[PDB]
Amino acid sequence: TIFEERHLKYISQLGKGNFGSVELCRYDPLGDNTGALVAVKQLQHSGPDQQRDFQREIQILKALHSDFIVKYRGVSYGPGRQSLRLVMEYLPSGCLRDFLQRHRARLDASRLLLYSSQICKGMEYLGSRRCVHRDLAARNILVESEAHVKIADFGLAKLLPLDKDYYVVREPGQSPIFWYAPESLSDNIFSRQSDVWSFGVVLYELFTYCDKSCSPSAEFLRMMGVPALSRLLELLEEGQRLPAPPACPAEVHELMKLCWAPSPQDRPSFSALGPQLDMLW
Numbered sequence: 001t002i003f004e005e006r007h008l009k010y011i012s013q014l015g016k017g018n019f020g021s022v023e024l025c026r027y028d029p030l031g032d033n034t035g036a037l038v039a040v041k042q043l044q045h046s047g048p049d050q051q052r053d054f055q056r057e058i059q060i061l062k063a064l065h066s067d068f069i070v071k072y073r074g075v076s077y078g079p080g081r082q083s084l085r086l087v088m089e090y091l092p093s094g095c096l097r098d099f100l101q102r103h104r105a106r107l108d109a110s111r112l113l114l115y116s117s118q119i120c121k122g123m124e125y126l127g128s129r130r131c132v133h134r135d136l137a138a139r140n141i142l143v144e145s146e147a148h149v150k151i152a153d154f155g156l157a158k159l160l161p162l163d164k165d166y167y168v169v170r171e172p173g174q175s176p177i178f179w180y181a182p183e184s185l186s187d188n189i190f191s192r193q194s195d196v197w198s199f200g201v202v203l204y205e206l207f208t209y210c211d212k213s214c215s216p217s218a219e220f221l222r223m224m225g226v227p228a229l230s231r232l233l234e235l236l237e238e239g240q241r242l243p244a245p246p247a248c249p250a251e252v253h254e255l256m257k258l259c260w261a262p263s264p265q266d267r268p269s270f271s272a273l274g275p276q277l278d279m280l281w
């Protein structure tokens with residue numbers, strides 16, 4: 001629950017992003033290099049709202065207990081009472097994005113659908129706890145094992161007040177626009193309904209095995225052509241969508257098309273999506 005910085009022997013960097021970073025540390029009090037491995041998140045440079053946003057990320061993940069959400073192990077303190085580091089479980093297989101590229105000859109559509117089912121189930125749970133992820137993408141999903149995935153990175157995640165079912169953000173979204181729904185693009189509105197849209201892009205990502213050539217960014221920019229955001233909005237408002245991934249089963253592509261309904265209230269819920277994905281196995 002509380003990790004001492006003196007017993008957290010740093011190994012490598014696991015990745016960087018959103019004013020902070022994740023480090024592969026070893027929690028070994030004995031100082032012998034024989035202890036458990038943990039994923040440790042800090043901010044590379046602290047800020048005003050940055051420290052508050054990180055503090056909220058910790059609260060959110062502390063309160064999330066699902067087989068499809070990366071486990072919170074605790075915190076490591078410095079000043080009183082600023083929670084300097086966030087300690088999570090270490091999933092050696094890392095990102096689904098990189099795992100997909102590395103193992104695509106081994107992973108069939110059955111396995112891709114299992115992943116989808118698990119990502120969906122975890123999003124069902126988030127929605128149940130009034131949590132908008134706001135940054136669902138294959139880069140933000142982790143691999144526990146060959147048949148197990150968990151949703152990670154809650155750095156942009158928000159909690160819906162009980163009176164409101166949508167959330168309007170002020171600061172522009174510094175994440176690739178290719179995952180945002182039109183209402184996020186145009187009016188900075190985020191919901192479980194926008195997370196569903198971003199899930200369709202995750203299904204796209206899965207069935208393209210995160211190929212860089214037909215990636216959401218690569219393929220939309222190719223379709224585009226004015227500011228880039230405006231060009232994307234025009235495209236999607238005309239009803240233009242990402243093409244069917246090569247060799248993708250039609251039923252899956254149809255589910256992507258569904259997640260990509262222009263209006264948020266026409267998109268299926270994760271509760272509704274889940275058994276549909278289970279039908280495909």
Ligand SMILES: *C(=N)N1CC(F)(F)Oc2ccc(-c3ncnc4[nH]cc(CCOC)c34)cc21
Binds near residue numbers: 014016039089098153
């Ligand atoms: C995936 N290969 N990466 C690269 C990246 F996206 F830049 O950043 C990452 C940070 C951390 C991990 C990660 N790897 C292993 N165990 C983990 N537990 C929690 C996290 C955080 C996920 O942050 C996106 C990890 C992977 C990547």
